[model samples]
Target: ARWFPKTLPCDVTLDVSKNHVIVDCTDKHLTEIPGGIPTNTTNLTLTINHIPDISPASFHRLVHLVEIDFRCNCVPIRLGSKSNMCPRRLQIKPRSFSGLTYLKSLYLDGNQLLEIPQGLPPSLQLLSLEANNIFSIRKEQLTELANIEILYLGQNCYYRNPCYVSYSIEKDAFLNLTKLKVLSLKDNNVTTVPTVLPSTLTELYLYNNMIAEIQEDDFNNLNQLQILDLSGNCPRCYNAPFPCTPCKNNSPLQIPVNAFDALTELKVLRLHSNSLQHVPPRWFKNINNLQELDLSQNFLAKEIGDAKFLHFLPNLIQLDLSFNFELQVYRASMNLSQAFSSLKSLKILRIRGYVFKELKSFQLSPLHNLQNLEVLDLGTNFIKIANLSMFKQFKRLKVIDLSVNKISPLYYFRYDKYARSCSCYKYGQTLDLSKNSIFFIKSSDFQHLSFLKCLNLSGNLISQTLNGSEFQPLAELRYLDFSNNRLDLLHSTAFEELRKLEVLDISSNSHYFQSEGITHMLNFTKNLKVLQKLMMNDNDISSSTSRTMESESLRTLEFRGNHLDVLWRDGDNRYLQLFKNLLKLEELDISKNSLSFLPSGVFDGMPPNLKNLSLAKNGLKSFIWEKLRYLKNLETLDLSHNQLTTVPERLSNCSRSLKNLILKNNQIRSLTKYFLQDAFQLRYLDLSSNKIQMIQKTSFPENVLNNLKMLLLHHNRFLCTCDAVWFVWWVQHTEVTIPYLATDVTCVGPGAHKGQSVISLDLYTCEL
Candidate 1:
């Protein structure tokens, strides 16, 4: 081969006349740039080499250059004194680009930039300085980029400096740029929005900033903005006067209207991730054109009447009011009539937070006029009603979600005209009425709903046996949830007329059949063959009786949350061996029971293809690995809220195929080296709320967590001492997920540090 140049290409020329120029400097074995190549080159590519410095003279030769590609360089190249701001203190010349006036874009992404480069040409339009060491942006550093359009300065180590504070661009820094539209300063040490953003900007993403407040003047200049994403900023609205005046419907003095006047043209406002209370009525007075408003994930109190406070948004369409604990209608005077009327144009509404009480008959009548309403979700509300008149007004309503409510008396609403009026009424469709207070249902309750399909009355007080004819009217009823009730008996003819019944939830009603004078209801649905899902958790049903009552069509059986002492079959399949009959049972939940111990081959009689096995919340003292190793096809195992005292190494016997393993709220005190030695295929492992005090350094097997995505160990009582030095060191060095132990976690031993909170320890002696 011809002798290569002794040095790397230093002065690479660019061709302004031609459209493109390419230069390859790969594996050149050169530490510095060589003499000039050509003046007409437009592209220079350097790969697999070590170049430590590039002088200003080298860049002056490439006046017509458009792009420079430096890939796989082991050694960094120091440019000038200005580039010293780079994280590694690499020096680069200041105003070095004063000559490249035609340069439009520069990509210094993934570099060690401590601060942005200064004295850049005014013609520079796009600059991506992402993944650098920048801490703060000073006004003087950006003074020259008067014409810059887009600047992405995300993902930097700029937060390392204690004195360097984030500069706000809202004051006047961005007012100079009239053409700037899109700006991203995410992942910065910004504690607040810069007040100097240009009014012409459209999309501004400032997520992952340390923002805490959005003063009324914060968005004063952004009149033309459309999409503003302030999520992940942790904005905290100031506590205004309680019993907000604007929300006071009868107040004569008009509330200040300047709160939201600046965002009049805004369409999408994401105030979801914030701490807001008392919805200020003035906040919606000017945003009449607002289409999507996400106030979810907030502490918005429902005590502020929606009708009196939020009824002003006539043009509002979609509203998300979820994840708020204070959004319940606790008072009897609260109503949504006027609020629903104001949002007549609204299509979708999510009001699924905790509803304290049932709604009055006329409380929902105002929503009747919402002819465009398609989905009405009232789930997770404590609404317990015996009539359907509340929902009779929705003529065009397609989907009605009332799950996790308190609707009891299985067929109590059978005569409801709304049930018969819905065109989508089917036998298998779901109707969840769990966690309610219904004692019994008369046969006449199901007489009118001939098309009734699914009915969930789980967690009720129904205990009487039902006559077969009582369910004759519900010929189409397929799924029935009766779990968590007080039913002690079931009449043999209770479900005889329901030939199509498929799923039944009878879990958590262990006391139903055991009560005095309740024998008639014990075998009520014993003959129902179409049952698919049977949940009888937290009940008094004996294991032998449970097995004998198993149906051929039962696919899922949930007997958790009971008071059973054992979960195995005794002699003649009498007491605990009843699960043997449910050969087709695919899923089982026997958590929260009184099971003190498990017998050998207890799961051997279960279905060979069982998918899920839940034994959580039980008082299990030990885990017999050999007995459970036979469950070769088991998928999920939930052992949460139990009394396990140790982290059993035997769990690895079944870890090869086990997907989910929940062991939360246990008494586990330590984690040894072989605890998870063979859990290679485990995906989810929850060890939350335990007494785990120590974890050996080599406890986890090598690469065992390669497939483990989640490892929860929250709410544990760990010891903090010099002996735990290795644990603390590993935690600081690794990217492991640790619990967000509040400031209350602290050490308590040998002249304990009073009131001092440690990161990994629980405080037992600290006084509240």
Candidate 2:
């Protein structure tokens, strides 16, 4: 048989090759069973049609039928004037699935089905009913698929992009599905954990539902569970009364101390986006083997149970306790050092937003012993670690995050209110201290971090430099971020110790970088040839000569918000083109500068490998787009907030449509008809120009734009090339506007022809 049916039925399309046969009758306008389905059909797809009912023996002829897809089979019920499209709530005959007894997989999702169709193929292993109208489920409804291993009853049937459930399954509802391995009942109205899940279940998803309470025995039996998702299930509100009211009422969800008991085999558990006030005390006592857990985005502020609470989860590896504003890690009433020391095997732990300053209460400190921990995130806590020695004990620590806090004295242990002892004993590979109120860092400050590779101190009050002292301890450092600080004068020796650095960000430091810091930046950075990416924006590093840049590996760079008038004045001035030596760049952003003119071969300094380039917010009176046209890899070009007239014709020619084309706030005159002639996946096009005047209905067709999401032409012109004053009179009374063609016509010509604008320039040119 031919791949394409030559003389087949008008409504049917058969695809047959090898031994496989598939019958596709999608949107075929069929009212009843058509006689075109060959008896040997093994796969049948009947999507997007007005088929409300299917006979019980519809597929009897195809005895070996294994898969059937009946998605979107009901007539749309929407009754609107302009819309010819509607959705469905299709009805299936009681026993229509009997003939396909051998069916191993089925697709009945995305419909208006109010009920689970009766008489399904009992031998089926995979059953999908996602995005349906079955808002509830019963024990009788699922007892038919006892042998099913993969069930997708997620979102509409009573749960997900998943389950739309409003259900309370019978006690023994899932007890018989002994072979079930994966089950989901997410996004529903479940008040409690389903007591009886299949014992063989390995992955279970019941998140994004209204499950507020989990009794002691709720999850008592499922020891084989590996991955469990209870995300977005808020049984109650934050800080509400105990067991306040379930579902819609304002209250907090509750999980008995023993709720997670006996689930010894559990590995991953997600419990975020719920109204859980405090950490579940004694809840994880049974799941010692658990590895990953998410308890974020709730009001989790109570006790991190004493040294004994987490004693059971010794094998646990990763724990996420971030984004709980009220969640403090103190239990002053309990022993501080020994409290969390029990979880000796934990490898990763995150706990943020604790404002530990006010909680000088000794009880709120973090765990004392996570020896194997590779990463420790304690950011945005407004914390003051009086004891730098507190972290000196994390011998195996790979990364430590202390961003957004108020702390000074890089690493010290407060011996008393007057003295603090420093240490280089426990240094991590990576450290983030951004948004912290730190004022100084002496060379000895990081001496102990000899093996450290990355360090971030951005958004800080680091007005004081290393005073020419060497970063002797950070010899192995590769990445250093000192952005958003008031760095007026950088010492040349400041980065002398960073000989092996790869990526450096000194952006938004100070305007004097051009006079004082640029000399220091270039002099020191020249030694670090391994550097890949560098950021120097928001500074006065004007001359490209200040760019003592590097090779292919050092590709990504940013120089926005600078005075780079030296090169823009002569893009061809190879001597002043500081970018000449840096030819290996892949992405470059030089926006927000005073760039006036770009000469051809301006990008001769840039490698042919360039991809993303942004030169927006510049005084670019002229551009050499041809210099950039050959950059086949170039995908983004931002020339907004500049002084230009037309988009380069070859720019839209040699290159495919770019992802971003920003010409907003420019002196562009007009975009005549399909200016964007290519099929560019233009995600954002901002050509809002006040000077635009002649934008006709023919210029930009919404159809030619394949995936152009935004077309901003609001402030441009809709009337260019006008003869005398004829258009202005008829402009107010014509059927010529669709999406207001961004005010057409602007002043682009020389002399008096400041030219004919669409709107106005007053008594000077062609008056309004």
Predicted structure with the largest TM-score when compared to the true one: 2
RMSD of each: 16.1, 13.3
Task: Give lDDT tens digits, candidate 2, residues 191-278.
Answer: 5677677778888888756676777776767878888878666633344322222345544556778777667788998776565665
Error of 2 at 387 (Å): 6.0
lDDT of each structure? Answer: 0.58, 0.62
Per-model TM-score on C-alpha atoms: 0.48, 0.62
Question: For all candidates, what are the clash counts?
Answer: 61, 50
Tens digit of lDDT per residue, candidate 1, span 357-412?
Answer: 65665766677787677666667666666454344455355455676666655221
lDDT of 2 at 132: 64
